[PDB]
Amino acid sequence: ALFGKGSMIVVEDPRDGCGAYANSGACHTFLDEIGDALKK
Amino acid sequence: MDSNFLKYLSTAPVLFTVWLSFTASFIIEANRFFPDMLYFPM
Amino acid sequence: VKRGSKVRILRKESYWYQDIGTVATIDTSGIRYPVVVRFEKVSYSGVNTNNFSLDEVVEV
Amino acid sequence: DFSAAVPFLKRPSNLDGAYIGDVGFDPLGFSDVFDLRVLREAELKHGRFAMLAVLGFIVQELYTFPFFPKMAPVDAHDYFVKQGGGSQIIFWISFVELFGVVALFETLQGKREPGDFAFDPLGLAKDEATLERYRLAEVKHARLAMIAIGGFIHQYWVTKQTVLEQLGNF
Amino acid sequence: DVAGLTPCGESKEFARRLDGSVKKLQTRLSKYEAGTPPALALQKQIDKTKNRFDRYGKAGLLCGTDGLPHLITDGRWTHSGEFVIPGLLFLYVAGWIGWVGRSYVLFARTADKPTEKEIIIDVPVALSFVSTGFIWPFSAFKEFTSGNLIVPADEITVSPR
Amino acid sequence: AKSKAVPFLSQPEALDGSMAGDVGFDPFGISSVIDIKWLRESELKHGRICMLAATGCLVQEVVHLPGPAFSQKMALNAWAAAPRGGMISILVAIGLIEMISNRFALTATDMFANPNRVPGDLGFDPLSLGANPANRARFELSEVIHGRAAMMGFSGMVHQMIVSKQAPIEQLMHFKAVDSSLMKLGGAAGNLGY
Ligand code: CLA
Ligand code: CLA
Ligand SMILES: CCCCCCCCCCCCCCCCCC(=O)OC[C@H](CO[C@@H]1O[C@H](CO)[C@H](O)[C@H](O)[C@H]1O)OC(=O)CCCCCCCCCCCCCCCCC
Ligand SMILES: CCCCCCCCCCCCCCCC(=O)OC[C@H](COP(=O)(O)OC[C@@H](O)CO)OC(=O)CCCCCCCCCCCCCCC
Ligand SMILES: CC1=C(C#C/C(C)=C/C=C/C(C)=C/C=C/C=C(C)/C=C/C=C(\C)C#CC2=C(C)C[C@@H](O)CC2(C)C)C(C)(C)C[C@H](O)C1
Ligand SMILES: CC1=C(C#C/C(C)=C/C=C/C(C)=C/C=C/C=C(C)/C=C/C=C(\C)C#CC2=C(C)C[C@@H](O)CC2(C)C)C(C)(C)C[C@H](O)C1
Ligand SMILES: CC1=C(C#C/C(C)=C/C=C/C(C)=C/C=C/C=C(C)/C=C/C=C(\C)C#CC2=C(C)C[C@@H](O)CC2(C)C)C(C)(C)C[C@H](O)C1
Ligand SMILES: CC1=C(C#C/C(C)=C/C=C/C(C)=C/C=C/C=C(C)/C=C/C=C(\C)C#CC2=C(C)C[C@@H](O)CC2(C)C)C(C)(C)C[C@H](O)C1
Ligand SMILES: CC1=C(C#C/C(C)=C/C=C/C(C)=C/C=C/C=C(C)/C=C/C=C(C)/C=C/C2=C(C)CCCC2(C)C)C(C)(C)C[C@H](O)C1
């Protein structure tokens, strides 16, 4: 298939296990900063 | 822009001064960001 | 030669020796140098025309 | 003939009603030397900036955006010089003014009215007669606002109170 | 190393050059207070001097007895970045300028007034030519072999003797 | 005879609404000095490179080839980490593609010598997806628009990686606003140097 067990293609998750909006903790999105600026 | 003023900017002393000022300016900028290049680094 | 033809000059003391000029007129009299040739370069004297003999002029 | 505005001053002679809002007022004679399309370009540009500035000076007193700290407009100039917002505004104005340079060249070449950028999104200029009255109002408001903006900034300097609060006090 | 020279990273005289150059700047810095603009400027110079000496030490340059870096230009590949590779870069730029200027002179010959094109340059056509120079070796060699670079001896004006 | 994009300017000559994406947008009149065929070749080329580049940034953030040399989420770091030999192999392969696909007509003076040559049309249709001539106009239009959008988007992604040292969608999901103390713009001559 061109890729063996060793040297397999690497697929990761950018989202990092959190949402677009209304997050809590070590995850603060661009949309959350839009909400943060609008309430200040 | 006026075609006679653009024809004046196409005269030899103006283009010579602009081209070598541009040339001088990117040598100056290259020696600002990358100074003291005595050798090709390799 | 003919008028309006392009010619290569073969006079070794010409300014335009081995360059191309154009034949202006050709005299029919007993003239020593009957071919009138014009050039685009000026000579050191600023002249751009000269008389030549047939032998001195070759067509290109 | 005599100037309509100043009865005892003669009419300038380059000002024969060609430009709306002309009242014949030009004593120092800048239209006898300079191009009136360029001068009307400059009058309308200075006037539009001034009209926006007076609205900004008052609205900025009434409200300011939550993400920015509250402060007076001259202090706003200095804060946004040091903050970075001023450079953004200068850059985007400069960007628009590039196509404004092209527009002024089009005016000099005869194919554009001096303040015309074809900016009528809301279709307010319904008819040509309405446009003539509207541009007379624009010229009058532009001139009045140039005077007004000078007053607000200079008075703020002399007495450190904002325009709405200076009307409110004294 | 080569020709009895010493690599600059272990020559002690290169080290004394660096130390004397920094003491010369530090004694000028000793006359100014910390946050002043002359103090900041001299500290920037001290950092720049140290950076230059450190870089030269790790570059493979060969210092002499004087402690100044020397250039080896006999053709060996371990020193090609001192003359051979800068030379290849130069010849590419110089051949570009020559090819582009020649192309404009040949265009200007076919103009309505050929001498007006050289004191009042046709900038769109001349910029068209300046862009073409990136493949000057191939364009110029194909020009040569097609009999269009070199003119024959009998279309060239010469002196009587 | 006014421009449609810029209503207060006149319509530029060499822009006649024939080309796809022709909305009359040429305020600086580049088309009056530079032939429009060369400009459309350059626009299509820039746009295609950028389309791949924008997709490159996003996919490189998500999917990687194996190995530690290819584990660079931030795309600006991939430039330095990826093997030099293979990167220069890419550069040399690009050069060979440029000379062959253009058929040795590469210079401004010689490209388009053949009257059959069309701006942006290199003959590239491996799967004959443009065989239908009914789809030709909207394909040309959407190629031009995808190229323009991707030029703007890749420019944004590269300079947002410069400002924020984060890969693009991870920057969107772990967003941090500019302090303004860092990344000062200009200033080399205001302080008189240093
Ligand atoms: C681009 C035009 C051009 C080209 C292709 C050449 C080519 C040549 N010149 Mg000539 N030359 C030129 C311009 C040019 N020259 C100009 C403008 C001058 C007046 C200063 C001279 C004065 C001159 C002398 C005195 C000598 C040569 C010699 C030579 C030959 C060897 C290379 C050399 O010595 O360079 C030397 C180059 C110079 C001394 C001056 C070059 C000045 C600049 C860098 C080039 C001109 C740039 C031009 C404005 C391009 C604009 C392009 C734009 C319109 C698109 C070669 C035949 C030599 C020779 O006969 O050897 C056999 C020689 O002795 N040249
Ligand atoms: C003359 C033919 C040739 C040869 C002998 C090599 C030899 C090498 N290359 Mg390659 N390379 C070539 C042409 C060649 N290259 C061309 C033409 C390109 C440009 C497209 C590249 C781009 C390239 C990159 C980017 C890399 C190499 C690497 C390597 C080295 C390790 C190879 C390995 O482990 O393979 C075993 C591994 C595989 C077979 C994995 C294959 C991965 C897939 C197929 C990638 C998908 C290709 C993609 C669709 C490309 C489309 C663009 C293209 C059509 C233009 C090896 C020295 C790597 C290196 O230097 O590492 C030290 C590396 O990172 N090369
Ligand atoms: C043959 C091919 C078939 C392919 C079929 C699939 C593809 C079909 C096309 C799909 C096109 C995209 C559709 C979405 C796909 C993913 C769905 C999804 O779950 O998304 C994933 C994310 C949400 O992800 C959620 O995460 C949560 C945990 O945090 C949950 O636990 C789940 O993980 C998940 O539901 O969706 C979004 O972020 C949507 C954002 C909002 C999008 C618009 C909403 C509707 C429009 C109104 C908005 C108005 C805003 C005004 C301004 C507000 C400013 C603040
Ligand atoms: C089609 C593509 C469009 C590209 C748009 C460009 C976007 C970015 C442009 C700058 C953004 C905002 C700048 C604020 C940043 C800013 O203005 O900093 C200010 C800087 C000068 O420093 P100062 O005197 O302001 O120092 C001020 C003190 O506050 C700090 O010490 O201005 C410059 O000269 C920098 C630009 C280089 C000028 C030469 C550029 C190279 C010339 C090449 C030929 C001309 C090209 C165009 C030149 C303008
Ligand atoms: C063009 C266009 C459109 C538009 C638009 C916009 C944004 C139009 C905005 C227009 C504005 C803002 C006009 C404002 C004029 C201000 C004036 C006349 C000054 C008054 C102050 C005075 C006289 C004073 C004073 C005083 C002094 C100095 C200091 C005080 O202590 C005392 C005192 C108060 C007495 C839209 C988008 C609608 C669409 C449309 O299709 C095309
Ligand atoms: C020409 C030009 C254009 C353009 C363009 C551009 C910008 C084109 C860019 C093209 C690119 C980026 C091509 C990339 C190719 C990558 C390859 C072949 C990877 C090979 C990996 C290998 C061999 C491996 C490995 C392995 C190693 C060694 C060890 C392991 O530990 C890891 C691993 C297992 C993975 C276009 C078309 C747009 C228009 C116009 O016509 C002008
Ligand atoms: C039309 C017109 C106008 C206009 C205009 C404008 C705004 C024009 C702007 C045009 C632009 C934005 C052009 C962009 C070019 C970018 C390219 C070719 C990208 C190359 C990147 C590559 C090869 C890569 C890569 C990489 C990948 C992805 C992976 C990384 O790990 C590594 C790396 C970073 C190397 C004006 C106003 C002038 C007026 C005029 O009268 C009318
Ligand atoms: C033609 C042809 C074929 C083909 C083919 C191919 C390879 C077709 C592939 C086409 C592709 C890859 C198109 C990609 C377009 C990318 C776009 C429009 C991105 C715009 C980004 C924007 C607007 C942004 C942004 C961003 C910024 C700046 C701020 C960030 O914080 C976030 C954010 C992400 C929002 C094949 C080979 C099949 C054969 C066929 O016979 C002929
Ligand atoms: C530098 C600085 C800033 C600034 C700033 C600014 C914008 C300063 C403002 C400058 C302006 C707009 C001054 C206006 C002067 C108008 C006058 C004197 C009217 C005279 C009318 C007369 C004499 C009579 C007229 C006549 C009479 C009888 C009435 C009819 C009309 C007429 C016949 C003509 C900040 C705010 C950015 C802060 C920053 O950190 C540094």
Side-chain angles (χ1 to χ4, degrees):
Chain A
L2 174 74
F3 286 109
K5 181 63 65 181
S7 299
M8 189 87 71
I9 280 282
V10 183
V11 178
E12 306 149 343
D13 190 11
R15 315 184 301 259
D16 218 12
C18 65
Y21 189 58
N23 304 291
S24 65
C27 60
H28 178 243
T29 59
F30 184 60
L31 295 181
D32 283 313
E33 177 82 26
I34 293 303
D36 286 331
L38 294 174
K39 296 184 289 293
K40 185 179 289 293
Chain B
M1 184 96 82
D2 197 41
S3 68
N4 277 312
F5 177 70
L6 294 171
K7 189 152 145 74
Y8 160 69
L9 295 181
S10 305
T11 45
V14 176
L15 291 179
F16 185 81
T17 302
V18 165
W19 185 260
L20 275 66
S21 288
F22 160 75
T23 289
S25 302
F26 65 70
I27 300 172
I28 281 156
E29 292 290 346
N31 275 273
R32 181 153 69 96
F33 296 90
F34 313 107
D36 313 335
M37 299 307 297
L38 189 56
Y39 48 89
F40 184 87
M42 65 181 287
Chain C
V1 298
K2 298 177 302 292
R3 164 192 54 188
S5 71
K6 298 292 117 180
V7 294
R8 179 95 50 197
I9 296 292
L10 307 164
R11 175 190 284 183
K12 291 193 143 76
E13 73 190 80
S14 187
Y15 183 84
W16 305 274
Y17 169 64
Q18 274 173 343
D19 297 301
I20 301 160
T22 181
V23 176
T25 62
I26 307 173
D27 301 322
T28 71
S29 299
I31 306 303
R32 298 296 196 82
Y33 302 99
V35 192
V36 191
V37 187
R38 282 83 61 87
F39 313 88
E40 294 294 327
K41 294 187 288 184
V42 294
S43 50
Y44 288 130
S45 297
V47 179
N48 68 2
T49 72
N50 202 47
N51 285 312
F52 295 97
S53 176
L54 274 308
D55 46 273
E56 288 168 357
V57 141
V58 67
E59 289 274 348
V60 71
Chain D
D1 50 349
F2 292 156
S3 172
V6 190
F8 50 98
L9 277 194
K10 69 186 291 184
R11 210 187 37 87
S13 85
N14 277 293
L15 309 187
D16 60 10
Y19 304 88
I20 305 301
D22 175 354
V23 291
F25 176 72
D26 196 349
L28 185 62
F30 273 115
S31 67
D32 297 66
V33 169
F34 297 124
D35 188 77
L36 279 163
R37 293 173 296 197
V38 168
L39 295 168
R40 182 41 79 91
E41 180 76 32
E43 189 184 27
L44 268 179
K45 190 174 281 171
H46 272 89
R48 280 152 184 177
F49 271 119
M51 279 187 282
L52 287 178
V54 310
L55 189 64
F57 228 87
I58 298 172
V59 165
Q60 274 169 229
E61 291 293 326
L62 294 168
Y63 165 83
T64 47
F65 289 136
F67 39 87
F68 285 146
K70 181 52 209 160
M71 55 172 78
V74 182
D75 303 329
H77 173 269
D78 286 282
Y79 177 83
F80 287 96
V81 167
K82 183 61 69 182
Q83 182 260 349
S87 62
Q88 285 291 116
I89 290 169
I90 282 303
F91 166 77
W92 288 107
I93 289 174
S94 310
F95 178 79
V96 175
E97 284 270 332
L98 259 50
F99 318 106
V101 175
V102 177
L104 176 136
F105 285 157
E106 296 293 327
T107 299
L108 287 172
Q109 294 211 339
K111 68 174 75 67
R112 183 187 84 104
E113 317 301 310
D116 183 44
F117 291 97
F119 182 74
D120 192 22
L122 275 63
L124 301 183
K126 306 291 185 306
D127 52 283
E128 226 284 330
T130 284
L131 179 66
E132 297 314 289
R133 175 170 36 77
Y134 276 5
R135 65 178 64 250
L136 175 66
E138 163 172 65
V139 171
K140 283 199 204 189
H141 277 91
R143 290 172 185 174
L144 189 50
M146 292 180 187
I147 298 169
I149 192 54
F152 311 134
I153 298 195
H154 278 89
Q155 290 168 234
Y156 181 78
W157 285 329
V158 168
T159 52
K160 315 299 294 178
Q161 298 177 356
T162 72
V163 61
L164 267 169
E165 293 178 353
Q166 190 181 11
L167 270 73
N169 286 40
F170 266 117
Chain E
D1 195 350
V2 177
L5 295 169
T6 307
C8 287
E10 67 179 1
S11 87
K12 179 263 289 181
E13 282 92 12
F14 197 63
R16 283 192 211 121
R17 295 265 180 192
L18 158 71
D19 283 305
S21 276
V22 178
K23 296 183 173 67
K24 188 180 185 291
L25 277 163
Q26 290 177 355
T27 302
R28 295 190 50 208
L29 181 81
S30 278
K31 297 187 289 183
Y32 293 106
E33 280 83 352
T36 56
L40 293 170
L42 291 163
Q43 195 54 55
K44 189 73 186 297
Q45 302 168 223
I46 291 175
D47 300 335
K48 273 162 149 49
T49 297
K50 287 178 185 178
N51 191 356
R52 176 191 327 114
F53 273 94
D54 190 0
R55 186 155 57 60
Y56 284 2
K58 294 164 189 155
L61 294 158
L62 292 185
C63 281
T65 312
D66 45 19
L68 299 174
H70 291 345
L71 303 191
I72 305 301
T73 71
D74 51 350
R76 71 187 75 231
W77 298 96
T78 69
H79 285 97
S80 61
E82 310 161 356
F83 181 78
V84 179
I85 296 302
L88 281 168
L89 290 159
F90 175 80
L91 287 173
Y92 187 61
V93 177
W96 186 321
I97 300 168
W99 180 247
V100 159
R102 183 185 183 267
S103 297
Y104 189 82
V105 161
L106 295 174
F107 156 81
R109 288 178 185 177
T110 73
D112 62 357
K113 295 181 176 179
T115 63
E116 293 293 328
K117 298 292 183 181
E118 296 185 351
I119 57 169
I120 313 165
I121 293 91
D122 291 333
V123 169
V125 171
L127 281 174
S128 313
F129 284 128
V130 304
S131 61
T132 65
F134 71 110
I135 45 166
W136 77 265
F138 296 97
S139 296
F141 188 72
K142 181 105 177 66
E143 183 69 21
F144 165 68
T145 51
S146 175
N148 283 304
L149 197 61
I150 303 298
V151 304
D154 62 337
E155 290 84 323
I156 315 181
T157 178
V158 291
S159 279
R161 275 282 84 96
Chain F
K2 298 292 183 182
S3 182
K4 298 213 303 285
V6 189
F8 59 89
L9 302 179
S10 196
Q11 182 64 253
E13 289 91 0
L15 265 50
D16 43 33
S18 77
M19 291 188 175
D22 192 330
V23 89
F25 180 61
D26 189 29
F28 295 166
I30 317 287
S31 184
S32 72
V33 296
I34 309 193
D35 185 72
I36 194 59
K37 279 210 222 197
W38 185 265
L39 294 162
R40 179 37 67 82
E41 186 82 4
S42 193
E43 194 190 21
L44 278 181
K45 192 169 283 179
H46 275 89
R48 288 161 185 168
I49 297 169
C50 264
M51 274 188 259
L52 290 188
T55 315
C57 299
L58 298 171
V59 175
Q60 271 164 54
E61 183 166 6
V62 186
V63 178
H64 307 147
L65 288 177
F70 291 130
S71 63
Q72 297 300 276
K73 293 181 174 179
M74 194 181 72
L76 279 194
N77 281 347
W79 174 257
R84 293 303 167 235
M87 293 301 289
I88 296 168
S89 290
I90 292 166
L91 193 73
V92 166
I94 282 169
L96 298 170
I97 288 166
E98 287 270 48
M99 74 171 184
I100 300 159
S101 67
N102 289 280
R103 299 177 203 173
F104 302 148
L106 332 169
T107 87
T109 64
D110 72 0
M111 191 157 80
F112 302 110
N114 205 326
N116 299 347
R117 179 63 155 84
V118 173
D121 187 354
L122 285 66
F124 174 84
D125 207 347
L127 307 177
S128 299
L129 290 183
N132 201 12
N135 294 321
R136 187 60 195 213
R138 71 173 185 182
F139 281 27
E140 265 186 14
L141 182 51
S142 70
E143 191 198 30
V144 170
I145 299 310
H146 273 83
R148 289 166 185 183
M151 278 176 253
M152 291 323 282
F154 173 78
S155 310
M157 290 177 184
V158 67
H159 285 98
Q160 287 158 229
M161 295 187 278
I162 295 157
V163 162
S164 175
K165 301 149 277 275
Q166 296 179 116
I169 75 211
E170 94 104 324
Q171 171 213 357
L172 283 181
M173 288 294 301
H174 294 111
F175 190 78
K176 167 201 182 300
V178 174
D179 280 22
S180 299
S181 303
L182 295 156
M183 291 90 55
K184 187 205 177 308
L185 246 217
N191 63 348
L192 307 176
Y194 304 97

